[PDB]
Amino acid sequence: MNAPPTFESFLLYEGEKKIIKELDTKVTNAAIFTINKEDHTLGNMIRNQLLKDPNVLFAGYKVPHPLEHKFVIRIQTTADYSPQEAFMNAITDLLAELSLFEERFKDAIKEKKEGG
Amino acid sequence: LIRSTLCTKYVSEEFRLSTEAFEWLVGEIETRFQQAQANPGEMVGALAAQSLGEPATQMTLNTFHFAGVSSKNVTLGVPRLKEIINISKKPKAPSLTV
Amino acid sequence: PYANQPSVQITELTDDNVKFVLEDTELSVANSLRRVFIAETPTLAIDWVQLEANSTVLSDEFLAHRIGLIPLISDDVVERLQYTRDCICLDFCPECSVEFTLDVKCSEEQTRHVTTADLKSSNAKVLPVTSRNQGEEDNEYGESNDEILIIKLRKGQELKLRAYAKKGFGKEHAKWNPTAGVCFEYDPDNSMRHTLYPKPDEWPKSEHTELEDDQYEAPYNWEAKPNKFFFNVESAGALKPENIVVMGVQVLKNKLSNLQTQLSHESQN
Amino acid sequence: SKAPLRQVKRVQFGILSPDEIRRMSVTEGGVQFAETMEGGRPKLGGLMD
Amino acid sequence: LKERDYNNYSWQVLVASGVVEYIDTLEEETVMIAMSPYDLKQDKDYAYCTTYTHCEIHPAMILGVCASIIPFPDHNQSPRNTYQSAMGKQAMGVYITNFHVRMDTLAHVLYYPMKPLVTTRSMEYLRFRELPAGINSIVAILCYTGYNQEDSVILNASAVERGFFRSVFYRSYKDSENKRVGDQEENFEKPHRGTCQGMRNAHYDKLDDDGIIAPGIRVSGDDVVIGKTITLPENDDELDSNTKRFSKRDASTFLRNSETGIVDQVMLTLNSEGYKFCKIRVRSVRIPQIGDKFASRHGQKGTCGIQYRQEDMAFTCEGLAPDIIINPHAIPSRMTIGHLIECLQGKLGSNKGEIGDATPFNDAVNVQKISTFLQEYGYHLRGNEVMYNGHTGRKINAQVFLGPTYYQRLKHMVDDKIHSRARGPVQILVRQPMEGRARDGGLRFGEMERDCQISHGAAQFLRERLFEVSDPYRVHICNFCGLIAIANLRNNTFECKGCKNKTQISQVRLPYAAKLLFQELMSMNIAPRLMVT
Amino acid sequence: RVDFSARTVITPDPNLRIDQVGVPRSIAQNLTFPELVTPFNIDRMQELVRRGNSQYPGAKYIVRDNGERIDLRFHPKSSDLHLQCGYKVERHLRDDDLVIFNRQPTLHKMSMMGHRVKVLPWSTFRMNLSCTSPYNADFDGDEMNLHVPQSMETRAEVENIHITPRQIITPQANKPVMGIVQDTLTAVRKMTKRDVFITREQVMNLLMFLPTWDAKMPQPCILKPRPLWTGKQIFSLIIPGNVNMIRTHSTHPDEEDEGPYKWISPGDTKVMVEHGELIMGILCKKSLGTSAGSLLHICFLELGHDIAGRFYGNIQTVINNWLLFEGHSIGIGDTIADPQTYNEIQQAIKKAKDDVINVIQKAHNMELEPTPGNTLRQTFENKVNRILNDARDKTGGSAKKSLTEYNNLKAMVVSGSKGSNINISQVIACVGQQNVEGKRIPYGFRKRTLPHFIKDDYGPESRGFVENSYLAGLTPSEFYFHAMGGREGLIDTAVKTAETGYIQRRLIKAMESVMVNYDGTVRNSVGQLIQLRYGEDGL
Amino acid sequence: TAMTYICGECHHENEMRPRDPIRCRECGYRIMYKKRTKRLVVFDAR
Amino acid sequence: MIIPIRCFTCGKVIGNKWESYLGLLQAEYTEGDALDALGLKRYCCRRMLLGHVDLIEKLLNYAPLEK
Amino acid sequence: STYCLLSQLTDRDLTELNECPLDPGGYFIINGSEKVLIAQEKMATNTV
């Protein structure tokens, strides 16, 4: 009766922006990014890629409710480096790592199949 | 309680309160004593009846683990409450403590 | 501040199972790879069932539920088909869905086993998984009933239906799950003390262990970080397991690129 | 309704006198017939007065 | 007896041979009954008794029918066994094998009922193996995100999408024509707008030409499902012959409002009076959701707090995501140790490939024996497993107890219990809201609610819930007499018959139940004069 | 009966703060609120009446000035969709709408309280976990009611009186009614231990769930070689303001306070919080429960209702997310003792059985002197019951003493979350003596409890003593004796409940109009003086 | 339009108009069932 | 009534492994050797075959409504 | 029971009549509704 449709966990509605950037007012150079219709996958990869950057000081995600498909990251960096640029760099490094893993896995599959 | 705790020995030898700390303490005691007063219009009879009838639902958790040490007839629990609410002219277990 | 250098070594590969090791990568990347193998890897499954004759002993929705869980061979097809929401079509274009038909009438006195061999397909590349089973003419196993039993019929009962199979992933519904259990394990010798054994002698050793018989735990290393992960991806027959891994990495890259595009779009404000 | 809306202040209980009951009743002459329904119309002096 | 399993040495021959006697509850005061043949062979130096007259066949026969389905009832607390005997009658499963021809008013049938892995021997004779009610499910007893607290359970959503505890709720409706010689006449036909008076706003296009719907038609909401129009009485008024625009009136049978499904079966017959008699059965699909009542075989009842998919689910090193997560805080105050022994023997019997024995008072089954047998299959000897976090992938620091148990779905779904009301029908006597979900009735703001609203000191909430949204009314009261006065609102006239008063008339807002109280007291020869001045 | 109400099954939701209730979408669309039309919200109410009843959020009616009701359940005449100032529009129940939440039977004041609506997807009324104690809810199929106020004065009364953070302290016993319960309390005890060291990554995840955090990271407990925080160092962030408290953990030894290690605990059992940050001790039910002088009571009395109500929810989101790192689980390994302990327990039970056989022998040999005040049967039964209860308590104490720190049944017992010492004793050591009406199992047969025993047997097997634990399983005679013992609790729960409710109704009807007046005196409905000051002190 | 039903034990296509009595015309059995409809209803396979 | 298509916890296809399971049971094997020969190494799939009861064979004995 | 039509019938004969072979019986059919008689306790007559 009140069962929500199963495609709302990954599909944006009409006029729903995916990323909502909110500037933090408590400290300096901090931002709260709200990403809709995603889950712990992207948040875990982006946070653990952000923590390899020495220029970030705080990075943490949170899913506010399991029934709402939405997660937030708070990012606080140094005073030479925007949090949005850090989020760019984390996404780019994750893409490079995944592309390298994809080509290494294809090479390993090829040599395992041809080697017998 | 004020005189027994805010004595000139405890606030000087034990607590060692300063001046402005002492007026802050006095003002906070006065304010929170004002806040603790009962509001006029507060229904205290129904509150008393509910706060006395609510424990009566919890008067069965000590039913087990009973053997008895004295062979004295005593009514305990909710029926004893029934003997005191109803003013029973014949109690089930009348007893004098002499 | 840069990316890792993940090294992969494959220990086993067969027609339904791959066992490999990830070296020099973070734990979030490996766990997200496991999640995208289970959930967001797309495959083909039946989604639109229409019944014209259902004189059997089971209901309409029960048969639709049993048909919808049947895995389909979708290795060469799912990367070209679009979703129904992404087509300009309305009446189920061939670049949007795959047509299946079934028409079985039992006229014999014995029990008729309606299986996946009776599920004909309009596409010559999308078949049920029992195309891998009908070619075994060396059947010393003793039984030729290697096909997924949809239903049993007695005499006088018939089943006629038309179905359309769509593209979807396991996040939407579990019938689109391509895998059948992804084993994922790091640090088998408990060298990091991520878990605490009250009696380490009471626990059986893992298959990826490096300890000998009289030892039970590795010595504690506080400097250690998780950079070696043992994966065992088992397929349910819908996709080859190497295709499961490749399409999972491709879906993760597409999601990250879409997030990057949306961030760069909102950046001009 | 152009009548003053007032809250009641007390309830004066009592016994209805037979003179008051005869005065306040809208059934002039009293209820006489036990038949509720009379030929497609309600009957005056009946139980469906 | 092995050759009555061949041919003919039945139990009556065994009783007639003189080895089994029927001892009643009055002869038991004069006989001595051995608990076991082990008691007979004791040496006389330490013998408890030497003169035994009878011996129990098996002590597990002291249980009933619903209480003998409990695995290890001698390891549980007794009120938990009583709770499971109460809830075994409310389980869900295949209640009978010929349910396709039966038409009961309410029926619940599971899709895939399974026999338990941890069985008792007494269920060989209750035919629980052939007509089971429940599912063997992999359960893990841990704390995951706090959504399983206070006896609640967490379901695997991917398993539910694979067919975990999905069921069918069958509901039957019936109707009959009446062709009595002195009566109104009604017929089974599709109603028409110009021929039927007082037709309810429904979808009448789904009916056939005989007013009876066909099987396979999807029905939902307030769809009409049996078409019956009754002939109006002959009120042929000669003053206006154009007022009889309708000769019939709708008396159709409507679907229940909050239910959807497919029409499963339709049958027509003749009743005892010989008139036409239609019975229809409509099936609905019940997928488990948040709030559905699940229960163990040990009194561990609860509701589904939340459902997680497999990628968000806690998982072992073998990729085994459990179906259900229960809270470990439901164990110590309940002392259902037989639940844990059932879980351990379920893991052992699933790994070995045997149906385990959970007959009570059996010394051949021990916790140490099950542990020793389970240690040989490459698992931890107490049944613990190392699981991982679903969201992050990190190992759980505390090792957790996982294994297959037998859980029963209960009939108390939330779709049969959810109710809301803004404004609807009222009673014809007190003009207060109705009773029940089926009549669209409001909630009972009883006496204790009034008590604690007095205790809160909220006068306006009391006035709202007891005058404003229950039954407001306005009455016109004579000032001199204090009784109810005649008030004609059209020409705006007021008249008190008992006082001959035309002007001094006040208006009082009051509950309608107070007005019935005052009019009933006026029938008690009491004058409750509301002195408004 | 009321009009605007709903009733459905409840399910837990730890991600909701205590002044919130999860409301299903069907209940939110069915229930309406008659919001007045102001110039402040004229555009939003116009788009609400343009959306209609088909879409959520929306409206069902416009109630205009003359009482005419305009239905929007059927697209009506665009000329009727005119919103004048002063009109009422019955909009749908949206977020942050004050409602009244009630479980039946209503026993006390805090059984129906104010809450704020959060509209959630599924179909059950999801409330927080700390609200289980005042409602006496169990989440096992409990149904519960919701009432919607229909006016802004009633809405303000719900806000200013009925709301949940204002109902924390009982006037019944000057203690909090809501406490930290279940695995939240268990992981509070498991987090605030001395050995819990938390890395930078886990702290930075856990600080996302603290909305009152001032975005300033505390300096680590350990700076080299690896930066680590402790569990107390992140619980100190949860505690707001100036909160100072000294209590003791449930396993605090009695001789530690007189020793030299009073202010430096070897077992970390002296709980001390100074200046709102936790310094010493492991928290438990004594510190974060319903007891008087606890942390919740102190922060309520020092900070106010709103800060304490946020503090109730700020504990649970941090703790339940640290529990994902830690985890907690009971199993069949937690109920099995050491073999040496098992041998000691069985030897103690056998020695107690030999003692009660010797007591029976000395009573049969006319050597048992009766105590004054009771007869020979009463003296004999008192001696037997004392011997068997001492045996059960001693075996349970040995079993609890022998358990390790990794045992989770002992963890939930010493945390106060669930269970007690008698549960450990009955699960591990022995169930003990069964009692019907505080006595022996009666001779239902002629001088026999069961036909398998002998006539005039007073030994502990026929009397009803259960020498086996729940892990070992009960013999059939003692299984039946335990069935008779367990029936008495259900019988006592049924019979009473009627006269208890009748007593409650009589008490509430005798005192329904007794009210503190504006002169400070306490008077009934007739104005008769009862007390010159309420409680003889006016507080 | 004379429609068709199924006899309970004959399993025979009986046909009649909606005023004839409910009666099988080959064996005389009082219970008949209505045939499954020709209208096609779409089922998702979820 | 009938064997499920997939394992509940696991997702492995078990719809083709019921008639083979019955044939291996009736030949000479025990249940453990039959489940090992079918390839169901995990007990999550073994509980799907050990606990399953075939109620469709009892349902097929009833005569169909339409001839 | 003895005097009903389903007395000592086989499973095939019960299935041909659309009756469950596992049905225990023990109930009446009154106006199409299955009615069961509950045994009532009473004190033993002719006992001192």
Add this chain to the structure above:
Amino acid sequence: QFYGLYVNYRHLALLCDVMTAKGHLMAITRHGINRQDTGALMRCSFEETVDVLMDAAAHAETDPMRGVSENIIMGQLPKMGTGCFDLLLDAEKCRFGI
């Protein structure tokens, strides 16, 4: 204190002063509550409704509308809790607005 339950002193002393207010033992029954000097609608709402109502009819007892249950029957705002006062609009306080 037999069951270990603690109730505050004010809720108990209020009941002990309610019973001993009239000079004799006023029990909480139908023989102590219905024998008081309260209104007819308050007494008939507890027990013996018809007897209390007809006694008030025969004796012409005036119910002064001071209890809470009497105003609940009338549907008025009950003179209790927050309804124990009246709000009046200050005419001279209506200063500059909008």
Add this chain to the structure above:
Amino acid sequence: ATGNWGDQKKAHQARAGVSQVLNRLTFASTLSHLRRVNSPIGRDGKLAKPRQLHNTLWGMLCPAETPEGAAVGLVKNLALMAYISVGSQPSPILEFL
């Protein structure tokens, strides 16, 4: 059909609930309803003695199957080998005696 066990005009003096609708929800529910024993004591007695599990119910009635609420201990279920006596004429025992 009604369950009132007596004359239709004088059903007020008759026992109610002797005949009940058979519970068809599970097979175990039907078997438990077919083996039910009802005590004639009404469900309002404050006395606890008829509701206690007696010693003499060993193997005759089920100890662990009673309803919850006010009907605890009065409604009960038979044991698995409980056989109720059909009844027989006392003649040939008397002539043999």
Add this chain to the structure above:
RNA sequence: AAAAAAAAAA
């Protein structure tokens, strides 16, 4: 549509 009875949930 009313009234009564029965079975249950907390």
